[PDB]
Amino acid sequence: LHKEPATLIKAIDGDTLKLMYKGQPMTFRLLLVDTPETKHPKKGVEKYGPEASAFTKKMIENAKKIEVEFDKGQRTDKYGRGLAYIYADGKMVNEALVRQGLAKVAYVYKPNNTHEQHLRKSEAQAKKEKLNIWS
Structure with a gap:
């Protein structure tokens, strides 16, 4: 995968x-x-x-x-x-939302699932910390 502007x-x-x-x-x-x-x-x-x-x-x-x-x-x-992963200064927005407890990880559709495991790790940390959606 490749990042475009x-x-x-x-x-x-x-x-x-x-x-x-x-x-x-x-x-x-x-x-x-x-x-x-x-x-x-x-x-x-x-x-x-x-x-x-x-x-x-x-x-x-x-x-x-x-x-x-x-x-x-x-x-x-x-x-x-467009279905994409979006980066703001090199930081993935999709992941930041899940990390702050401001999004859930969607039902995934093979093969658009390259960053699923990483996002599932972030979601489990937000659940563990009881943030926002998880409080």
């Missing part, structure tokens, strides 16, 4: 962002993580939703460099969102 357009919520990638606006969905939703139609804002959204927004807006890393499988979902 991208530029922020807009942070949409905790796990969805609009970036400029290879010259075009594209929506990205963060691979392997589920963040509580803010714009969820059924039962409005979920708990930790605004916080997960603020954490990704801060991390991405304050960064010097944003990179996008596709996994081994399909690179877009059925809604046309």
